[PDB]
């Protein structure tokens, strides 16, 4: 196939600050339904802490890729297994607070 995925950007707390429109096919929501909300809000309660600790660590990893697997609640009311790969970017011309760039794919847990 050609596995489906979408890019998002987040501030360090988890809030969606940018979402690529490929999110419709992957998790069923429109970008405007994600923008402004925290990724942790769509996350299964057993995986929320793992996701919060992952956000915290990705900033310590010096722009390196961090990967996390978690259950995301689609707009079709299903728990989807999502592998989110993320890394921080900070423009080295600036001292602006870094932010977090993600790619999000529905994967199989097996």
């Amino acid at each position: 196939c050609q596995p489906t995925r979408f890019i998002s950007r987040h501030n360090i707390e988890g809030i969606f600050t940018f979402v690529d429109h490929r999110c419709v096919a992957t998790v069923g929501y429109q970008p405007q339904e994600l923008l402004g909300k925290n990724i942790v809000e769509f996350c299964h309660p057993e995986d929320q802490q793992l996701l919060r600790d992952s956000f915290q660590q990705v900033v310590k990893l010096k722009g390196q890729v961090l990967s996390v697997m978690f259950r995301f609640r689609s707009k079709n009311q299903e728990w989807l297994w999502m592998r989110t790969s993320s890394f921080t970017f900070q423009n080295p011309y600036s001292d602006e607070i870094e932010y977090i760039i993600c790619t999000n794919t529905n994967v199989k847990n097996s």
């Binding site: 596995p3 890019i7 950007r9 690529d20 490929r22 722009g63 390196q64 890729v65 592998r83 790969s85 890394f87 970017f89 423009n91 011309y93 600036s94 602006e96 760039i101 790619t103 794919t105 994967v107």
Partner: protein
């Protein structure tokens, strides 16, 4: 004149350098529509004088996994070349694609 954040945009490439996705923001910066870029090689866009360096930068990316391009020209939709600098990050799964954070050095606005 545009600030740094307003001059930064994302693109995603398959391993052969083809665009698979581009931020809408490229349009106000370099004139292209993301739609017209899909399927085209990044390489079709580089100034010939920066070509050599972009090939090495790529090879370095494939072995390290993250690399900063350093300064290069990209041909803009409506004539002339714009200066960029790019950070490249390979995404491997279980290499799946390359994430590029692109920053336009040239003065814009």
């Amino acid at each position: 004149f545009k600030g740094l954040d307003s001059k930064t945009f994302l693109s995603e490439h398959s391993m052969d350098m083809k665009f698979t996705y581009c931020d809408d923001r490229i349009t106000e910066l370099i004139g292209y529509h993301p739609e017209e870029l899909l399927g085209r090689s990044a390489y079709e866009f580089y100034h010939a004088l920066d070509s050599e360096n972009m090939t090495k930068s790529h090879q370095n990316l494939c072995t390290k996994g993250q690399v900063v391009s350093g300064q290069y020209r990209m041909l803009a939709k409506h004539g002339g070349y714009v200066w960029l600098e790019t950070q490249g990050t390979v995404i491997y799964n279980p290499p799946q694609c390359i994430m590029c954070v692109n920053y336009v050095l040239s003065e814009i606005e």
